[PDB]
Structure formats: structure tokens, C-alpha cells
Amino acid sequence: MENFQKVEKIGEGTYGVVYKARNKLTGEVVALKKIRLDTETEGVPSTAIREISLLKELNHPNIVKLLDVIHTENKLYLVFEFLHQDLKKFMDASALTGIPLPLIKSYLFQLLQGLAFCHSHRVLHRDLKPQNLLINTEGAIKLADFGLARAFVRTYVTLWYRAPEILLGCKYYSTAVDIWSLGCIFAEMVTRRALFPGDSEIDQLFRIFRTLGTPDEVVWPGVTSMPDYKPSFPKWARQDFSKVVPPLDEDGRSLLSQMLHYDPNKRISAKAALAHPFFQDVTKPVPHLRL
Amino acid sequence: GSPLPVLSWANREEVWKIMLNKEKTYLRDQHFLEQHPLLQPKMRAILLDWLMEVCEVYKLHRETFYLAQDFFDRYMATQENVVKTLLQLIGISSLFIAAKLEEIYPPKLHQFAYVTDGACSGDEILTMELMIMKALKWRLSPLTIVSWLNVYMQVAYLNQYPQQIFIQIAELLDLCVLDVDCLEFPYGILAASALYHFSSSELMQKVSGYQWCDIENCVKWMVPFAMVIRETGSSKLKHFRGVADEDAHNIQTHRDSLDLLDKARAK
Numbered sequence: 409m410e411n412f413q414k415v416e417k418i419g420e421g422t423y424g425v426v427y428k429a430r431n432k433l434t435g436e437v438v439a440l441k442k443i444r445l446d447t448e449t450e451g452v453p454s455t456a457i458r459e460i461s462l463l464k465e466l467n468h469p470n471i472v473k474l475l476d477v478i479h480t481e482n483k484l485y486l487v488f489e490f491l492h493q494d495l496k497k498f499m500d501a502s503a504l505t506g507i508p509l510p511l512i513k514s515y516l517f518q519l520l521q522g523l524a525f526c527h528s529h530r531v532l533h534r535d536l537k538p539q540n541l542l543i544n545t546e547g548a549i550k551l552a553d554f555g556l557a558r559a560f561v562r563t564y565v566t567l568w569y570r571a572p573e574i575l576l577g578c579k580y581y582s583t584a585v586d587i588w589s590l591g592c593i594f595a596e597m598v599t600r601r602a603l604f605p606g607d608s609e610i611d612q613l614f615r616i617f618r619t620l621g622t623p624d625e626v627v628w629p630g631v632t633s634m635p636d637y638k639p640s641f642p643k644w645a646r647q648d649f650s651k652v653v654p655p656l657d658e659d660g661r662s663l664l665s666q667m668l669h670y671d672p673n674k675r676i677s678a679k680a681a682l683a684h685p686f687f688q689d690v691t692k693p694v695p696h697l698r699l
Numbered sequence: 700g701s702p703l704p705v706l707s708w709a710n711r712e713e714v715w716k717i718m719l720n721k722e723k724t725y726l727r728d729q730h731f732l733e734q735h736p737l738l739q740p741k742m743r744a745i746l747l748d749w750l751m752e753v754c755e756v757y758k759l760h761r762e763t764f765y766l767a768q769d770f771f772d773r774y775m776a777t778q779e780n781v782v783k784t785l786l787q788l789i790g791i792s793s794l795f796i797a798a799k800l801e802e803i804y805p806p807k808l809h810q811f812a813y814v815t816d817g818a819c820s821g822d823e824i825l826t827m828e829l830m831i832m833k834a835l836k837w838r839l840s841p842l843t844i845v846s847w848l849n850v851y852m853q854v855a856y857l858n859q860y861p862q863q864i865f866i867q868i869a870e871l872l873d874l875c876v877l878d879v880d881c882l883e884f885p886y887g888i889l890a891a892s893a894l895y896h897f898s899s900s901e902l903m904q905k906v907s908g909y910q911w912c913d914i915e916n917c918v919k920w921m922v923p924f925a926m927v928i929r930e931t932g933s934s935k936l937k938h939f940r941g942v943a944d945e946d947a948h949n950i951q952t953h954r955d956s957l958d959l960l961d962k963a964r965a966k
């Protein structure tokens with residue numbers, strides 16, 4: 409670790425401490441994630457063993473690269489590619505003017521490509537949210553913090569981006585939980601505010617029902633049988649998507665409602681979302697071989 | 700071939716290719732013990748059998764056991780001149796890394812030190828885990844022998860699955876894994892051949908994509924192991940205290956498999 413110079417502390421959380429750093433020789437700027445081991449009775453944290461092993465195998469232009477893993481007496485540093493900002497800071501900074509629609513489309517397209525790559529490797533991110541989406545000055549956005557990432561998984565993300573099946577006590581997670589979070593983020597980029605800003609699990613569920621309507625066996629077969637479902641839930645009408653997301657066109661509202669479908673089995677996949685007419689301009693036609 | 704159905708969440712061609720590529724990049728050597736001249740194959744079998752025993756005692760998953768087995772064999776192929784006194788430490792540390800990765804609430808470090816009766820301390824296990832993880836280049840996401848059985852059972856009961864049939868095939872795979880010669884065959888071929896010994900060639904081609912020619916040498920190698928299991932009868936599905944009844948098939952079990960291994964090794 410002698411060849412690195414810490415420039416600034418970017419943050420501190422359950423991940424550990426993240427720093428901006430420089431390779432003294434090379435001159436490259438990296439992001440360092442510091443993990444203390446002396447303060448860990450169980451040794452290398454399971455969450456770090458899983459992140460390192462997973463990112464060594466998940467190489468994609470829209471997933472932060474793990475460049476190296478350095479062990480330095482009672483410390484473990486994970487050297488990552490550096491990115492200048494997170495999506496939450498960018499969204500707050502752009503809240504008065506708004507993020508231009510072409511950029512929302514571009515960021516969403518890249519997010520779905522990263523997500524589709526993860527899902528083809530059978531990996532659920534489980535924690536998609538703005539502060540986990542890192543952007544750069546060259547127009548790219550990348551998926552970060554793979555601490556909660558599990559390969560399919562049973563139920564045991566911060567409230568606002570949590571799928572309704574999770575709030576209603578479903579026993580098993582699916583790829584549809586990540587799609588739900590992206591739809592929330594997509595709507596947040598559009599409306600310049602959180603789509604469902606709940607303060608409890610019941611508040612989160614009721615806020616989801618006030619925008620999409622209280623679900624029934626018709627829209628979501630199985631919903632009434634579910635563990636945390638109550639028949640006493642107030643009956644709310646589904647709000648018109650032209651009011652939920654006014655800056656969005658017909659193609660935008662179509663994609664958003666498919667990503668926010670109640671039923672995990674009917675919620676659009678990342679690969680299917682990339683083929684939506686909302687990205688007809690960004691996507692190119694590919695010949696299919698029947699065989 | 701590819702036995703996967705049409706997937707909603709991703710393209711089945713990509714999902715299956717990544718799985719085949721995982722088996723390409725994760726390498727195993729049936730002659731890794733030649734790098735350690737003081738070691739004999741019966742030591743590996745006794746150690747893996749012991750890990751299986753401690754796995755059942757702590758109700759650890761079969762994936763946890765196969766993650767430790769794979770980490771052990773792969774780590775030992777990066778080392779030279781290892782003595783048998785160091786084998787218990789390498790094994791329980793492989794199991795510690797695996798439980799941390801696969802279990803939700805894994806056993807504590809002191810419980811891993813405990814099962815060794817003082818031959819391994821928590822500090823030694825913590826030093827050894829870092830040696831294993833660094834020597835394996837942090838490549839700790841293999842497709843275990845038991846994950847392939849799981850994939851095959853999922854495809855079969857689509858065209859959830861039955862617990863009793865699963866544990867009978869898994870029981871045969873546990874016997875095979877004690878022989879370092881199993882490492883000649885890709886993990887997916889060992890599981891396809893164990894499934895064949897409990898069904899037919901038609902079913903293994905349907906759930907695994909393999910052709911008969913692919914698994915044939917493995918089938919003829921597995922024949923003694925499969926016969927020793929047939930002679931004695933297969934095990935009954937056990938109930939595990941504090942374990943959901945829809946997950947009991949996924950809990951590692953132990954048997955007097957070392958004498959069964961001697962009968963299969965004779966012929």
C-alpha cells in the first residue's frame with residue numbers, strides 16, 4: 409500500500425471508509441475501500457469476501473471495476489476505479505432545472521445493461537438506490553456496492569426502493585426486486601423527487617398503493633394469501649401515469665409501468681426493458697437466427 | 700447442448716454460457732497430491748469426510764461443504780510440500796470461508812476452533828483464511844458438484860423438486876468426492892453421471908444437455924461407488940432441528956462412507 413496517496417475521504421458507512429487516492433508512480437486516480445480487520449472477531453467480513461469474489465467475475469462497462477485487493481497488516485484495501493459523483497448528489501444538484509430527458513434515457517439504458525449483465529450471471533444486487541449509482545464526467549453511470557449482492561435467495565435495500573413483495577413478506581427474492589428499484593430511480597430522475605418516500609414498512613406499502621392502487625387477486629394472484637397482507641388495507645385507485653410522471657412520453661410511461669408491476673412474475677426483465685420502444689433510438693436491430 | 704428453458708429474467712444462451720465458462724476458469728487437478736510428496740490420497744478423503752461430519756453437527760448446507768471441498772483442492776494445487784499435520788487447519792479454514800459466504804448466520808470462529816480440540820486456534824484460522832483466499836486469487840464463486848445436481852433437479856421438475864431423490868444422488872456424489880480421481884471429471888459431469896445412476900441416459904441428457912458419450916467414462920468410473928450405494932440401500936430424508944422442512948434436503952449429512960469408499964476402490 410506504499411504506492412498510494414490518500415487525497416480525500418469520500419465517505420464512511422457499513423462498507424468501511426472510501427477514499428479518493430493517487431498511484432504515486434502510475435499517476436492514476438482510484439477509489440480505495442478500507443476494511444479494518446483488527447476490529448473484526450470473525451476475520452474478513454463475509455460481505456467483503458462476497459463483494460471481492462463477485463466483482464472479480466463481474467466485468468462490465470457499467471459495473472465499478474475492482475482493480476486490486478491489498479492486504480496491509482490488520483487492513484484490507486480494495487482498489488476500485490474512481491468515479492467523480494453519485495446519482496443522489498447529481499439529482500439534488502440538478503433538482504431545480506431537471507436532468508435533461510436524453511440523459512435520463514442514457515443513464516437508464518446503461519443501468520439496465522449493467523443489471524442485465526448481473527442477472528445473466530444470476531446475481532441479484534438487492535440494494536439499488538441513487539447513492540449506489542456512480543457517474544463520471546464522460547457520460548457513464550455504473551452499479552456500485554455489491555455487499556448485499558446474492559446469487560439465486562431468501563428474505564431476511566432502504567425502504568424507498570424496496571419492492572412490494574418484500575414489504576408483504578414474500579419468502580424468496582427474485583430479479584424483479586432490482587427492476588422495481590430502477591423504476592423508482594427512473595421516476596425519481598423524471599420527477600426530481602422520490603416516488604415512494606415512506607417512513608415505515610406499512611407507510612411504504614400505503615404510499616405504493618396510493619400511486620399504483622391497492623392490489624387484488626386480479627392484478628396480482630397470490631397477494632391476498634401473502635404473510636403481511638391485511639384485508640383492512642384501504643382501497644386506493646391507481647393514479648393516472650400522466651400525473652405521476654408528466655415529463656414522460658407514451659413510451660416512457662409504458663416502460664415505467666412495466667418496471668413497477670405488482671406481480672414479480674410479470675415485472676419486465678432488464679433484457680426485455682432494453683428492447684422497449686423508449687430506447688428505439690439508443691438500441692440497434694440485430695438479426696435473429698431461428699435454428 | 701443447453702438444457703435450460705426459455706428464461707424471462709435473461710437470455711438462456713447467455714445464462715448457460717456463463718455457467719459453462721465458470722467450469723472452464725475454475726480448475727481442478729486429480730494429481731495435486733503429487734506436489735506434496737509426504738501426502739497420500741486417503742488423508743484427503745479422511746479430512747473431507749471429517750468436514751462433512753462437522754457440517755452435519757452444525758446443520759450447514761451441502762453447498763457450504765462443497766465450497767470448502769473445492770477451496771481445499773484448489774488451494775492445495777497452489778502449494779507444495781504440505782505435511783499432514785497442517786491438513787486440519789487448511790480444511791476447517793476452507794469451511795470457515797465457505798460458511799461465511801453461503802450461510803445466513805454461520806457458526807462463530809470459536810466453534811470452528813472448538814471442533815479441532817485445540818489443534819487449531821481462532822488466530823490460526825484467521826491467518827490461514829487470508830492465505831487460502833489470497834492464494835486462490837479471491838476466486839471463491841465456483842459451481843460446486845452439488846450446485847449442478849440442484850440445476851439438474853430444477854430443470855427436471857419444470858419440464859421446487861423432490862427431496863428424497865435429491866439426497867440419494869447427493870449421497871452418491873459425497874462418496875465419490877472422497878476419491879481424488881473424481882477431479883478428472885468436470886463437476887457438471889460428476890453430477891450428471893450420479894443422476895444417470897439413479898435414472899436414465901434420456902433424463903440426464905434432458906436436464907444436463909450432455910450426450911451419453913460425454914458422461915460415459917465418468918459413468919464407468921462411478922460404477923463401483925454407485926454399486927456400493929445400491930447394495931446397502933439409499934438413506935432416508937432426515938429432519939433437522941431449527942431447519943425448515945422445505946430445506947432439509949440441502950443440509951449436509953454424514954455416514955460410515957469411508958468403508959464404502961474401500962469397497963468401491965477395491966473393484
Ligand SMILES: CCn1cnc2c(Nc3cc(S(C)(=O)=O)nn3C)nc(N3CC(F)(F)C[C@H]3C(C)(C)O)nc21
Nearest residue numbers: 418419426439488489490491492493494497539552553
Ligand atoms: C468504491 C467504488 N467507488 C469509486 N468511486 C466512488 C465514489 N465516488 C464519489 C462519490 C462522491 S459524492 C458522495 O460526493 O457524490 N464523490 N466521489 C468522488 N464514491 C463511492 N462511494 C461513495 C461513498 F460514500 F464513499 C460510499 C461508496 C460506495 C459504497 C457507494 O461505493 N464509491 C466509489
